[PDB]
Amino acid sequence: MNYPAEPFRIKSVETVSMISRDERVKKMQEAGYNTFLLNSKDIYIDLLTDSGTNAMSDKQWAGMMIGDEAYAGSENFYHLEKTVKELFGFKHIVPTHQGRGAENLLSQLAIKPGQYVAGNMYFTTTRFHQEKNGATFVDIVRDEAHDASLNLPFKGDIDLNKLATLIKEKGAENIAYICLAVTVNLAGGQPVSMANMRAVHEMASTYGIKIFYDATRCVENAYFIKEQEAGYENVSIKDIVHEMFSYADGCTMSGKKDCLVNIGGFLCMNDEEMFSAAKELVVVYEGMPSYGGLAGRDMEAMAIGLREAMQYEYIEHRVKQVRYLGDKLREAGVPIVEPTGGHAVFLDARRFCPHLTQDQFPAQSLAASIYMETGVRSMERGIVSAGRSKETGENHRPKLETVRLTIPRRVYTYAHMDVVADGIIKLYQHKEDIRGLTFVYEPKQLRFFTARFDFI
Amino acid sequence: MNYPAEPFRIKSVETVSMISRDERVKKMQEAGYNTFLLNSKDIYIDLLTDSGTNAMSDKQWAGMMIGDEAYAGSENFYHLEKTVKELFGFKHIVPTHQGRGAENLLSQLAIKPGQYVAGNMYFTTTRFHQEKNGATFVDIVRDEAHDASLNLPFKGDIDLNKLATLIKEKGAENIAYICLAVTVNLAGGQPVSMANMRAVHEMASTYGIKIFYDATRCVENAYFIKEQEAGYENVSIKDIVHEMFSYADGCTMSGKKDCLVNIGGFLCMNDEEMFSAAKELVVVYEGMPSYGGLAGRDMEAMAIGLREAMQYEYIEHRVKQVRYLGDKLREAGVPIVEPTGGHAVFLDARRFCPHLTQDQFPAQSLAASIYMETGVRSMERGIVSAGRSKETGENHRPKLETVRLTIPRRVYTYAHMDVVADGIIKLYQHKEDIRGLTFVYEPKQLRFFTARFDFI
Amino acid sequence: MNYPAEPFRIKSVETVSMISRDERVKKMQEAGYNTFLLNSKDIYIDLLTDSGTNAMSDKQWAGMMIGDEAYAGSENFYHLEKTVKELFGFKHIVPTHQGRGAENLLSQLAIKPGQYVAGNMYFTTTRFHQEKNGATFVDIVRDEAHDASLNLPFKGDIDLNKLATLIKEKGAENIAYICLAVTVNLAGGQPVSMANMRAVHEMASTYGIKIFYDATRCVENAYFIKEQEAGYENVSIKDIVHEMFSYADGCTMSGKKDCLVNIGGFLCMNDEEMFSAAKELVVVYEGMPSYGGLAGRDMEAMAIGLREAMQYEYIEHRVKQVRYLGDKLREAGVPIVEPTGGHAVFLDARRFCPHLTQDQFPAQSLAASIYMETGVRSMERGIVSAGRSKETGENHRPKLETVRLTIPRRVYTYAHMDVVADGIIKLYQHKEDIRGLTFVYEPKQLRFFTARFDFI
Amino acid sequence: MNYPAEPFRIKSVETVSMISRDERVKKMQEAGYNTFLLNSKDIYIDLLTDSGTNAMSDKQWAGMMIGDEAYAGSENFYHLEKTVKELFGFKHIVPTHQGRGAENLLSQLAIKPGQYVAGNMYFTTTRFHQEKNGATFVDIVRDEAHDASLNLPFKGDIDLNKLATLIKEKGAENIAYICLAVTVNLAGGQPVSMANMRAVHEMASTYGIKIFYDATRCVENAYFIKEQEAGYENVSIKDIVHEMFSYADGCTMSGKKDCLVNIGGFLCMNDEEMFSAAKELVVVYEGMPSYGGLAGRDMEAMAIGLREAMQYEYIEHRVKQVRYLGDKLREAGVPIVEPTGGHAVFLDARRFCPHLTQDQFPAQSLAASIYMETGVRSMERGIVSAGRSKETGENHRPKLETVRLTIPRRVYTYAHMDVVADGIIKLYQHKEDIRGLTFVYEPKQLRFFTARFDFI
Ligand SMILES: *Cc1c(COP(=O)(O)O)cnc(C)c1O
Ligand SMILES: *Cc1c(COP(=O)(O)O)cnc(C)c1O
Ligand SMILES: *Cc1c(COP(=O)(O)O)cnc(C)c1O
Ligand SMILES: *Cc1c(COP(=O)(O)O)cnc(C)c1O
After folding, report:
1. Which residues in this protein are found as N6-(pyridoxal phosphate)lysine (chains A, B, C, D)?
2. In angstroms, how far is the first alpha carbon of chain A from the final one?
3. Could you give the CA distance from residue A190 to residue A180 in angstroms, rounded to a whole number?
């Protein structure tokens, strides 16, 4: 079915104050037209992020009641360890409080100063930890991933020729690891094929280069393989996930994404040497290796949630709900990154607002307008988030001037997707009336989080 | 709009095993083709009843954690008492474990043998307790309410001429009370207008006749007043509810319906002597007047839920979701009771199965077919539920031979309603294939609960 | 050992406002010196009752999160049914909201007006439902059980000679059933031996007389058998419980006592005809036979709790904690009912206050003093609770003028027992300062619940 | 009084499998005689740590149900921020997943390479982060604090002469900050007086030196001030805590200790530039400044718990329960660190096992014996934990060869303390039977966590 019904019932709800348009305009002005400054209580549908915003199940909430809060030897740790070894196949696990904690560990352990990390695009925290520990990031994604209009499957795939060029020019010994992300967030959540994971493993194996997955949306990725990669139609999500990780030496995972939890992550690896070093290191940043900065109840919820994510109907519905939002927007001509990824729809605010110049902040303006018209919060991922250049004082001009509609798992319905799409379509049909913005408060750093604007 | 989005988010989900048609056919055979015998875990969308099946909010679940389980003086009792007095306006409350416990109390307190209770149709438990304590029930609903095809507003209204006739022929002193139900279940969940409650109170007040509401779906009723009764468009649900009860001397309430809980009810009254007598009586049937057969946590959840029910957008969506299901069925030509009530859609199994006689149990079989083809459970409300006659041994032949699609509050989405409607519409396209049923096991009483059948 | 440590850890706490003595005096005065009028929030240690006040486990709270709230076929019902069948051995179960709901069913099903019910003493709700349905209660406990000073083991045992006399004089066909309570509440919570249950069964079996247990404290009873009955030292609690019920045809249970829950009960029986009649009756008073006036989550919690109650160390500690309180009072010369029962200690307020006459309400005043000095709530079980006579308007003069210290399961510690004992001992050492009370407000009904007093 | 009762009730329990001595011996052997390798499910009373093992209240669990999981603008963040500002008095807060996450931030922000951090002893993670960022740690605690036998109040106090000497010898500009810990863990949990905090602040103010508290047990510290410091007898815990922090420029806090939670921490500061820099840094290690690596529900639980910790009777009981354990051991002549601190009792395993040399691991073996005899887990804090020298490959010979009995808050009773004390006293009476240990597996890293031993 194009748009299957939810393969679950609602067990409990979060109530919403259904405030008026006038009230939303006031709240938006009080937030300086910056959606990052809005209060959660003033938001109907919060699409700021799919990270940690997921609805847990009744079974996960039952697990939340039997947290074994012991510092070592917790039953919840054993459950998480058993589940991750079974489903991902790695020999060892170190829990962390979320994904960036695992990235801190991996990059400290696996990078020597002056080395390169080759990846299919990048994510802010992952790249920070690579660079902080002395690596230079090299993008080896296929060229097509950078073409936001191209409707192509498996746009997250690595170009093996780019990897070959890096090996030839820099030397395999100088590549700390290949960081293969599933899905690829910067391209809109685009999946990587099993064939590509296998090919990257074969080339890396020839040269002794380690591969670590940035695995935060690996289950969404597995769904795309099942749906679209020839031969996988009748392979279970579980068996796809297991095969995916068979082509990796380890992973960093955010449970806040595909493990259906509000907090939690982990680092996996296969060898005793890195496992021993990771256990020593985790103590000072996260906690003992037996909890890694998580309550026992959260190790339990994450173990339960990762197993729930293997249910075909759950992940099919998850991805097809995002697809529905993209389909409704595309039918109305709204400019979006193509094809729709696993977790979000990215609006092209530059094309959405052709009457605004980039220094009038099309993405920031569009996000503000979306909230005022619907109560939907979305994230600016454009010139404002790109920051101001410390050298010239000019704004960095990113290629993507994006508004991100990021969909939490199991929280919203198709009717909520219609609220989102209908309001965006109404804005697009009168796009020339969307007012641009100008800074009235701009901090020197992290400006997306607290900058304030007025209209122009 | 016709079909507003849910005015809430999903906080937690209830897991569903997405079983296949073959499995459902086997489960239905094992249940003897009686949907009442199906296991909950084998059901995707359970529309057996809206009683006690509601999804609570995060706020209600927080209240569930601060149950004050004291036998007397519980904080939760004081919260429930304060909330009910504020919203319903009655002077006194006695909690009960659910509505029929309150009915037991009211009928023991307010009826002496030989008296009459006049009501707008009846409900099984309510009428049982009236008749058990010596009353003769008199139906005073308008004759039009018995016509399942009449698209008339406020079909639950009392015929004031029938009430005047009963007073004249029997004497006001021989009428124990008027039992005014909101909404009216037997007519399909039909509302009563404020003008009708006002007129009934005016006539009753002339003769000193008490009025007690069967109030289980009073919030659904208030919504219909707001939507459809002249002068109430801008009045809040809270203010409508308060005016409704101003025309009564008390009520029996099932929190399991419009208080958004899974258990709980209460008896309200203004009269001091009745209150003291109720408190003495409740001890032996329910518990002390300070908890009434409920855990403290459930008094808390019911207090919170009743207040949540006052949110306009919540109850508008609740009723319009039921209406959506009826609209989709009607647009496809499926025969249903009209107009759609607040809580359920009733299929007319006579017209759905014109190849079957009523003695071949078309409602029972239609319910079985719906489950086998969709995973949706519905309730037989026809010849099987009516039972067979004691003196003649023959089955009763109720005018209404229906299948009830009863919608729990805050549990399902419009996509779930589409599963229900699409499956019923598909069955209707080949309705001649629905096979008649015959008893293979028939208990002497309560036969609908456990009877088993096979195809003819 | 005499006083084992708690065989559990504290998972969560209920905070207490440790109000000062001056504040407690003000609260007691606002309650008119009636502890039943105190607010729970003003009480440190609430020994009003062991009914429904128990602390659940983490595992029970996990069960509370997987309530299957379906009207029929709930997984929680199946769990409860399976557990009770395994542990009690009866063929059939009908859930009820608490014990008095099951007593209503049993008494309506198993009694004809004018018949006799023979039992080992009585309890208020149980005897009401027997007499309301036309039975005459006959006490067949041993005369020694009525001697509150006598340190007799198995004080709850039925006198087989009194049962034989009833059979011979009235005829077995005129005995509706024998009601055997385990333990016996009116004597202070006293156990019945396995030999006695066996002998009652053998005699009833000869004459075809049915036996139904009032099983509310059957696990406390099983502990006394294991501790004190020859040959049972090495038999598990579970095997003792199973053998106990092998000597009955059914039981009524309040889960609020030994099933470690805050709400819940059930009726068990072996007979198919009675099971069918119970199911017809439960519908109008409690709910369908598939939930019986309980939420699914509560059927789950009760199933889990009954199994937890079988842990030897739990029930040993439960009973020995009550015994500790009795021992500390006895060691200080405080007059108490003997021997200490499974769930409560009874102070003899007549001997505690020899300077007061019964018409000066020594039990009521002693309970008030206990609260003022410690923050402990206890229950008057004397002249005030006995009420004012129907015919003469004079106070009843009960032989037992007592204050009940009733201990919830898993809520308090030995240090709390010391707060209770130390405060009572201190009062005893200046008992002449306890002032008599007189009514200032006396309702006609349920006077113990709301009467108010002042000092003479 | 010496040993007040728990100023709370039990709301829920964690059940325990009450296994036999023979079973515990087998489990201890399976764990290689290392208590860190025991399974939580096999432990009756787990005194491994007071970190994150606390029992939350019903009110905290209610907060756990209303987690606002929004990435920014969560209601739970605002509650935590408001509560911490009110109670600790600092202008700004950055949540962190636990204390060591806040230490990472503080040390990166406040230390330039080569600077000194002066502290009253040290904690492993806190000192790691100081040294990792280029500081040299200098101990400025009073020399008497290193005398484990000395019964002296406020043994955690800084020696003002040592602070003055450091300032004179190194220069104020070369002191990054004074790290004042409350209480002082390495001395056994010893408190710091208000007079000392005030004097340290005055001296630092003269030279412009910043003070940051390591505040994990600040409420235990406040209790000792109230109990023992001149002028504080009648000052509330809340007002003592507020005054303590008035002598600091910020703090690192572990909610896992005195905020009565299982996870959570935070960084506080007054300086705006440091706050802005901390928010930049938290993004990459913990999460956005609006959640800091915590679920919303945990920010809520920590806010509620910190307020609960202010209740005088709670913290009095907390500290006096630990004191009771120390008193019972001292009365029997068992050698312990003196005086007892706020959170733990430390056994002197050197004196407990005079027949063993330190290279035979007496603390490790004593911890194993305690578990085998009682089911109590304790932590080795001696030669094994001290590790093997970095340069010579020899074991360190720490002066303190201790076994730590660390008491979680609100989890255990005095009867549990008696299980602990009675078992240790019984072991002490035949201490010569405790066998020495030798390594069978010694990891090169983090050896205390996974080393395995056998008897010599
Ligand atoms: C979420 C995200 C991360 C970081 O995980 P957190 O749990 O948020 O720290 C890393 N990589 C990608 C691709 C992500 O989307
Ligand atoms: C549900 C119902 C009742 C009985 O309430 P319960 O809580 O189920 O006992 C009474 N009247 C009407 C109209 C009902 O729908
Ligand atoms: C508690 C009690 C009852 C009644 O049970 P409830 O659950 O309180 O209705 C019946 N018999 C005895 C002996 C009791 O103690
Ligand atoms: C607990 C502890 C810490 C570290 O806090 P965590 O929350 O465990 O990271 C820092 N200092 C002291 C003194 C501690 O006891």
Report:
1. 257
2. 45
3. 12
Candidates D63, D41, D137; CA nearest to D303 is D63
Give me Rg for the CA atoms of chain D: 22
Are the beta carbons of B8 and B410 closer than 8 angstroms?
yes
Chain D residues in contact with B66 by the CB 8 A cut-off are 58-59, 61-62
Backbone angles phi, psi at B400, to 5 degrees: -90, 115
Radius of gyration of chain C (CA): 22
B8: closest CA among A17, A11, A61? A17
Tell whether A97 lies on the interface with D, counting CB pairs under 8 A. Answer: yes
Say which CATH architecture domain A58-310 belongs to: 3-Layer(aba) Sandwich (3.40)
The rounded distance, in Å, linking the Cα atoms of B137 and D355 is 92
Integer Cα distance of C321 and B105 in angstroms: 39
* Residue C37 contacts A, CB cutoff 8 Å: no
Instruction: Tell me if chain D has a CB within 8 Å of the CB of B61.
Output: yes
> CA nearest A366: which of A446, A423, A447?
A423
B124 has catalytic annotation: yes
Q: Measure in Å the smallest separation between the Cα of D265 and chain B Cα atoms.
A: 23
D283–A446 C-beta distance less than 8 A: yes
CA distances from D320 to C301, C396, D260, D315, D347 (A): 35, 49, 17, 8, 18
The amino acid present at D269, given as its one-letter code, is: M
Closest alpha carbon to A53 in A407, A413, A449, A415: A407
Number of neighbouring beta carbons within 10 Å of residue D357: 13
Q: Return the exposure string of D270-289: e unless at least 16 CB atoms fall within 10 Å of the residue's CB, then b.
A: ebeebbbbbbbbbbbbbbbb
What tokens were used for C16? 């207490």
Question: What resolution in angstroms does the PDB record give?
Answer: 1.3
- In the numeric block, the tokens 């000095």 are attached to C373
Specify whether the CB–CB gap between D60 and D255 falls below 8 A. Answer: no
Query: At residue D92, what is the residue type?
Result: H
CA angle C200, C206, C208 (to 5 degrees): 90
In DSSP notation, C240-257 reads HHHHHHHT-SEEEEETTT
B153, exposed or middle or buried, with CB in 10 Å at 0-12, 13-18, 19+?
middle
Who contacts B393 (Cβ-Cβ below 8 Å, separation ≥6)? none
Start-to-end Cα distance in chain B: 46
Q: Are strands D402-406 and D344-348 parallel, antiparallel or unpaired?
A: antiparallel
- Angle subtended at Cα A161 by Cα A160 and Cα A166, rounded to the nearest 5 degrees: 100
Q: What's the number of CA atoms in the CB half-sphere (13 Å) around residue D387?
A: 11
Contact B70 C78 (CB under 8 A): no
Amino acid (1-letter code) at residue B450: T
CA nearest neighbour of A411 among C153, B202, D448, B8: B8
Interface of A with D in 224-263 (CB under 8 A): 262-263
The Cα C156–Cα D436 span in angstroms is 56
Token couple for C178: 């024998």
CA distance C357 to C436: 8
Please state the separation of Cα C108 from the chain's center in Å: 22
Do C167 and C206 contact (CB within 8 A), yes or no? no
- Alpha carbons D295 and A264: distance in angstroms, whole number: 9
Query: Are the beta carbons of D413 and C413 separated by less than 8 Å?
Result: yes
- Residue B358 carries which DSSP code? G
Query: Please, are residues B435 and B365 in contact by the beta-carbon 8 Å criterion?
Result: yes
The rounded Cα C132 to chain-centroid distance in angstroms is 21
Q: Which residues of B are less than 8 Å from D56 in CB distance?
A: none
Q: Report residue D230: phi and psi, to 5°.
A: -55, 130
Determine if residue D293 is left, alpha or beta; phi over 0 gives left, psi from -120 to 50 gives alpha, anything else beta: left
- Tell me which method was used to determine the 3D structure: X-ray
Which residue among B58, B82, B91, B124 is the active-site one?
A: B124
Is C448 marked active-site? yes
